[PDB]
Design a protein around this ligand. Structure first.
Ligand SMILES: CC(=O)c1cc(-c2ccccn2)c2ncccn12
Length: 114
């Protein structure tokens, strides 16, 4: 059922998820687990939602995928205090993805597609 872009995005998503072994970013954050969340965070995102979007072929480019990844991390760093596991893990994931999906890495990949 898959396409080349879907396989590349599944690769990036798997590598990001390895950083979150307990699955704190695996499913949506609800108001039950996080008080007032829907008041503070306008556009929720999580790794499960991203996987579903890849499978449905909703992402046209690495840029569109990268935007959801950063949104997920940015929501966590805005809602949670800096002394929490959620804030610190989000900062770790953000750094990982910026390295993995840099313009330099994407250029090397594009050169290998010749
Ligand atoms: C990602 C996130 O911000 C998050 C995940 C969780 C979470 C999700 C499931 C089980 C345990 N923790 C959470 N709890 C309180 C405040 C914030 N969070």
């Amino acid at each position: 059922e898959s396409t080349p872009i879907q396989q590349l995005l599944e690769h990036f998503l798997r590598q990001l998820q390895r950083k979150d072994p307990h699955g704190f970013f695996a499913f949506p954050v609800t108001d039950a687990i996080a008080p007032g969340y829907s008041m503070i965070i306008k556009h929720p995102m999580d790794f499960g939602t991203m996987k579903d979007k890849i499978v449905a072929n909703e992402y046209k480019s690495v840029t569109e995928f990268k935007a959801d990844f950063k949104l997920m991390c940015d929501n966590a760093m805005t809602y949670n205090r800096p002394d929490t596991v959620y804030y610190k893990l989000a900062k770790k994931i953000l750094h990982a993805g910026f390295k993995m999906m840099s313009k330099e890495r994407l250029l090397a990949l594009k050169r290998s597609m010749s």
